């Protein structure tokens, strides 16, 4: 790892700023595309709409970020039932062999950009039914997954930590800078 910086060292460090790219771009067109990508990523991270895809027990914790203690609504996060209106699909439960074409069709009808959160050990790696005859060995064999939330029923702080990690990934998305360098 790295040691987290001591406050004597960290007082000499300057402020990071909001932009992961920095304001030190050379060209004015590159700087304008950087700020446009910053505004676009702020709009995308300011409201991600996850889809009501609750397969198994993990989803009982998924409603617990809907719950008044954790309150996902002040993070841009609000559930949508239709897959067209939703940004994120949260695979929260056990993907089985009869569940595989349904999950693939629901993911394919979702419009791009598409970030996928694997909630729980049945969602990533198979988990407690990994050696079962009718359980897919994780959802990574079917749906491409950006965030993997570890706990068997993830606490709801850990699922919301996965949500904040997805927001940091969305804030780190480089589209217009790649277009300028394509």
């Amino acid at each position: 790892q790295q040691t987290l910086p001591v406050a004597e060292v960290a007082q000499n460090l300057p402020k990071k700023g909001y932009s992961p790219f920095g304001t030190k771009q050379s060209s004015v067109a590159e700087w304008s595309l950087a700020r446009l990508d910053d505004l676009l990523n702020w709009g995308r991270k300011g409201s991600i709409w996850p889809l009501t895809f609750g397969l198994a027990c993990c989803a009982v914790e998924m409603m617990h970020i809907a719950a008044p203690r954790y309150d996902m609504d002040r993070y841009g996060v609000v559930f949508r039932a239709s897959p067209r209106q939703a940004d994120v699909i949260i695979v929260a439960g056990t993907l089985t062999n009869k569940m595989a074409p349904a999950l693939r069709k629901v993911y394919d009808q979702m419009p791009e950009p598409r970030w996928v959160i694997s909630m729980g050990s049945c969602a990533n790696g198979g988990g407690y039914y990994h050696y079962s005859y009718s359980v897919v060995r994780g959802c990574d064999r079917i749906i491409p997954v950006d965030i993997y939330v570890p706990g068997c029923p993830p606490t709801a702080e850990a699922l919301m930590y996965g949500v904040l990690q997805l927001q940091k990934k969305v804030k780190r998305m480089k589209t217009l800078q790649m277009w300028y360098r394509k």
């Binding site: 790892q1 987290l4 909001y18």
Partner: protein, 68 residues
């Protein structure tokens, strides 16, 4: 600023912030403070310095080298 997360809390204040104990490390002396205790690190996943697994045992079957 704006890059904070839930893993910036070190190990000694983690139980104080999560209501396990009501004793801060400035008053509690039960903490070990040993020599080999590594400093705290945030979740480094998604960056160019994250952890990637590997086999930890060495090679079991030793081949035969025509030389020697």
């Amino acid at each position: 600023n704006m890059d904070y997360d839930g893993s910036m809390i070190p190990a000694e204040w983690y139980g104080w912030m999560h209501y396990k104990t009501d004793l801060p490390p400035i008053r509690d002396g039960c903490r070990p403070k040993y020599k080999w205790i590594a400093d705290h690190s945030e979740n480094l996943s998604g960056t160019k310095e994250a952890y990637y697994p590997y086999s930890t045992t060495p090679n079991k079957v030793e081949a035969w080298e025509p030389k020697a």
